[PDB]
Structure formats: structure tokens, C-alpha cells
A paper describes a structure:
Genetic, structural, and functional characterization of a multi-donor class of “public” antibodies revealed an NTD epitope that is recurrently mutated among emerging SARS-CoV-2 variants of concern. In conclusion, we find that the convalescent plasma IgG response to SARS-CoV-2 is oligoclonal and directed overwhelmingly toward non-RBD epitopes in the S-ECD. This includes public, near-germline, and potently neutralizing antibodies against the NTD.
The light chain contributes only 11% (86 Å2) of the total CM25 binding interface, mainly through a stacked hydrophobic interaction between CDR-L2 Tyr55 and Pro251 within the N5 loop. Ala109 and Val110 are buried at the interface in a binding pocket framed by the N3 and N5 loops. The Glu36-Arg246 salt bridge and an identical CDR-H2 contact between Phe56 and Lys147 are conserved in the 4A8-NTD interface. (D) The AV dipeptide interaction with the N3 and N5 loops of the NTD is structurally conserved between mAbs CM25 (red) and 4A8 (pink). SARS-CoV-2 variants of concern contain mutations in the NTD N3 and N5 loops, including Y144/Y145Δ and K147E (UK lineage B.1.1.7), W152C (California B.1.429), and 242-244Δ or R246I (South Africa B.1.351). Additionally, we confirmed that an engineered N3-N5 double-mutant and native B.1.351 (28) both evade neutralization by mAbs CM25 and 4A8.
Author numbering:
A (entry chain L): 3 to 9, 11 to 30, 35 to 57, 65 to 72, 74 to 80, 83 to 110, 112 to 127
B (entry chain H): 2 to 9, 11 to 30, 35 to 59, 62 to 72, 74 to 111, 112a, 112 to 128
C (entry chain A): 14 to 32, 60 to 219, 226 to 270
Write the structure that this text describes.
């Protein structure tokens, strides 16, 4: 299983970062994607192929890859962003499958 | 692409269950189909789906025996069916889709979810 | 079905001397942004007979439709061309407003497939049908450099439908150079239209269902 931190905290406007890490098999070999879920609503795709943004996504979001880990950058934090974030990838094991990270709650003071 | 799936079900333990996903604005035969589960307060758990590299459905390791998938290609509904229900099966189940000509990194449209509860 | 592919921009068609004046049509015209595509294929009159020629790379052009009103009150003739066979039919087609031969992927095997129901909704009281080797043969080969030119003549005055065709290599850029069956169809012909083939695939999030796209295509017309 790919690891994630449980929670991150900041005031509006500062920097924060989210980190997703694990085996070379999960992160290293393949592309990564990121999802946001609001409480009580279906998930939404945020970024794909490490860096691309689909239409309508604001500029405040960016993505990066770091060997067998990857990170999310948030700018301009606004109080609406009380949500979970999950990384997801294929698994390249012979038990080949998709894998979701443990999720992180973002809290803002 | 637009998706609508059948509403919630309440049953007693040991029952089976079947849910439907209706795809519109597009034709089912172009789309790969996947099912994903969320228990209360937990992270997402993938249950299985079609793999472009095999041309076949693939099942999640913990479920292999319990789950079945079928289509009505005459009414472009996908179906998923589950045996041997138990109380820890209570969750919200989502329908999601992705590219089919290549292994995609994403699932873009998601259904509104449906909640299955089983008690007493 | 037949989602309304249409384009705002239109221009007075340029024309060139055939070595008479022939009008030059652009079917799919690339933007300077490379972004938008212009789908437009007019209906045209049929004064006695028509000369048709085009130079082509990629099978974008697949056949023609002929009739008078082009709707269920009258017979009409349809010609369409697979990779392996032509089929010629007379049926009382109900053409939709912007016909094209849609082609799409069929995941359960490694095939592309095309469906006729994107050009008409129904047929009835149909009569004549015929099958043969294709007309739109590729040239047996040339190494690019406008690797082919194809020319056709259609004539109907005698109470028969007559095709003529030729295939040739060519060299000159963008201009006309100085260098098959007889069918006993009983029909009244007064207008005609060419039909293209367009393809669709799902590959990027958030794109519209009207993903239909094709390369550039052009052709020339002139009346007998």
C-alpha cells in the first residue's frame, strides 16, 4: 500500500504540500493521478499524467513526481478547500491492479 | 458522457445484490467500466473492472469469488452482482469509466453513488 | 441521430480552368490556430451530368447520394464503399440533414467498425441492389508526390446510369494538370451530395461527445 500523511494544516494564502510515497512498483514505473472529494459528493479528477490539468481546473494546482514519491502543491489557499485528496496509480505487480492512497484531510485555520 | 445508477437497497445477511449503471450520450462498447467502493469514513477501495491489455474483466484480489459483472449491450446498461452479503459489505458503490484503446491513468465521470445497507 | 455538424465561416469558392471554369470546394479546412475544423458539403444541382475529380491520401471520401428531394417521398440512389466491396442500392431512404459514415472502435476485438445509421434513419419499399469490387481503389503505388488523381463522369440522360472512371499518377502542385458499370436504374435525378467518413475516440477528459474529426479533404466539380 502507498503511504500518505493523515492531515495537513495552514492559514489561507500560505504554501502547503501533500505527499504520496511508496514502492518503485507503484509510483516509479507508472504515471500518477490525483482526486478531490468533497464531503457527501462524488469524487472529481484534478490532475493527470503527473502535470496536466483538465478544463476548468484553476491555476492554484500543480503536480510533481519524485522517483517513487509524488507531491501536490496548493497556492492561495481558500476556505472552500476543506476536502480529502487521494493519489492513485496502476500496480505493475504480476498481481497487476489499480491502487488508491490512504487519503489526507486538509484543514485550514 | 453521463451516468445514472439504480437506487439504494436494504436486505438481510446472506442475500445477493445487483446494481445497474446506465450510460447515455455515448455508446457502451467504446468505454471501459470499473467499480469502486467506499465504506463509512474509509478510503476508496477498488473492486475490479475491465483491463485493456487482456480484453477481459479483472477482479480485485480480496473479492475474486464473490463478484460478477455483465452487460446488456441492447440497453447499454452495465450490471454488477454480489453474493453472500454481510454487514461489513455496507458501503456506497460508485460507477466510473475510462479510456479503452490504452491503459488510462484516470476515471473521469463518476456516478452519484448508491448506498447498500444490511441489518438485523 | 446525425448531430448537426455545421460551420459559420463560408467563402466564395475559387475556381480554375480545367485545361472551362470548374469550382473548387474545401470540405475540411484547417484553422491557423490548428484548432477548429470547417465541416461543409453543399447539395448541388445535376444539369445533365457532372465531372468529378479529387486527389486524396486517406479514404476520407466514400461515395455519393443522388435523388430529387432526398427524403421519404421519393426514391434515391446511394453508393458507399467498404475497404473490400462497393454496394449500390435504390431504396426509399429517409436521409438526415447532415449525413456522414461514422466509424468507431469495438473493444471486444481489435477492430474498427462503421455504421450506416448515421446517414439515414429508415428505408422502405426498397428495390435495386448490387455488389462488386470497390471503385475507390488505391493506385497500385506511387511514392507520394500527389500519389494519385481520380476522375469520374456520371451520365443519366439515356434512361440508364453510367459511370466512367480513370486513375493516374501526377506531379504538379495544387492544380489540375496538362499531364465502370451500367445500371438500369429507373429514377429521376436532379440534385446530389458527397458523403465523408468521420472517426471518433475517447482519449481525453472533458471532451464533448461530438468528437468527430478528420483530415483535410478537397474536390473539384464541373457540369457537362
Amino acid at each position: 500500500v502507498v503511504t500518505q500523511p493523515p492531515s495537513v494544516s495552514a492559514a489561507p494564502g500560505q504554501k502547503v504540500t501533500i505527499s504520496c510515497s511508496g514502492s518503485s512498483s507503484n509510483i516509479g514505473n507508472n504515471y500518477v493521478s490525483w482526486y478531490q472529494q468533497l464531503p457527501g459528493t462524488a469524487p472529481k479528477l484534478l490532475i493527470y499524467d503527473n502535470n496536466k490539468r483538465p478544463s476548468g481546473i484553476p491555476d492554484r494546482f500543480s503536480g510533481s513526481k519524485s522517483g517513487t514519491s509524488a507531491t501536490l502543491g496548493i497556492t492561495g489557499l481558500q476556505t472552500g478547500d476543506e476536502a480529502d485528496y487521494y493519489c492513485g496509480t496502476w500496480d505493475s505487480s504480476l498481481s497487476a491492479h489499480w491502487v488508491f492512497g490512504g487519503g489526507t484531510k486538509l484543514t485550514v485555520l | 458522457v453521463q451516468l445514472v445508477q439504480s437506487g439504494a437497497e436494504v436486505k438481510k445477511p446472506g442475500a445477493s445484490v445487483k446494481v445497474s449503471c446506465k450510460v447515455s450520450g455515448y455508446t457502451l462498447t467504446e468505454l471501459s467500466m470499473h467499480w469502486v467502493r467506499q465504506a463509512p469514513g474509509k478510503g476508496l477501495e477498488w473492486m475490479g473492472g475491465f483491463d485493456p491489455e487482456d480484453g477481459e474483466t479483472i477482479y480485485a484480489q480480496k473479492f475474486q469469488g464473490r463478484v460478477t459483472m455483465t452487460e446488456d449491450t441492447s440497453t447499454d446498461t452495465a450490471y454488477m452482482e454480489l453474493s453472500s452479503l454481510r454487514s461489513e459489505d455496507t458501503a456506497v458503490y460508485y460507477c466510473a469509466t475510462g479510456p479503452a484503446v490504452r491503459r488510462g491513468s484516470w476515471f473521469d465521470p463518476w456516478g452519484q453513488g448508491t448506498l447498500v445497507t444490511v441489518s438485523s | 441521430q446525425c448531430v448537426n455538424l455545421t460551420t459559420r465561416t463560408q467563402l466564395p469558392p475559387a475556381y480554375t480552368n480545367s485545361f472551362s471554369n470548374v469550382t473548387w470546394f474545401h470540405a475540411i479546412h484547417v484553422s491557423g490556430t490548428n484548432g477548429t475544423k470547417r465541416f461543409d458539403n453543399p447539395v448541388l444541382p445535376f444539369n445533365d451530368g457532372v465531372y468529378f475529380a479529387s486527389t486524396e491520401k486517406s479514404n476520407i471520401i466514400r461515395g455519393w447520394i443522388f435523388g430529387t428531394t432526398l427524403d421519404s417521398k421519393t426514391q434515391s440512389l446511394l453508393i458507399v464503399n467498404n475497404a473490400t466491396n462497393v454496394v449500390i442500392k435504390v431504396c426509399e431512404f429517409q436521409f438526415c440533414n447532415d449525413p456522414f459514415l461514422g466509424v468507431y472502435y469495438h473493444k471486444n476485438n481489435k477492430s474498427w467498425m462503421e455504421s450506416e445509421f448515421r446517414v439515414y434513419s429508415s428505408a422502405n419499399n426498397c428495390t435495386f441492389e448490387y455488389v462488386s469490387q470497390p471503385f475507390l481503389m488505391d493506385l497500385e503505388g506511387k511514392q507520394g508526390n500527389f500519389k494519385n488523381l481520380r476522375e469520374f463522369v456520371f451520365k443519366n440522360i439515356d434512361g440508364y446510369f453510367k459511370i466512367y472512371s480513370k486513375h493516374t499518377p501526377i506531379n504538379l502542385v495544387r492544380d489540375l494538370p496538362q499531364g465502370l458499370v451500367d445500371l438500369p436504374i429507373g429514377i429521376n435525378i436532379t440534385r446530389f451530395q458527397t458523403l465523408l467518413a468521420l472517426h471518433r475516440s475517447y482519449l481525453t477528459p472533458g471532451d464533448s461527445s461530438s468528437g468527430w474529426t478528420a483530415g483535410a479533404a478537397a474536390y473539384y466539380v464541373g457540369y457537362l
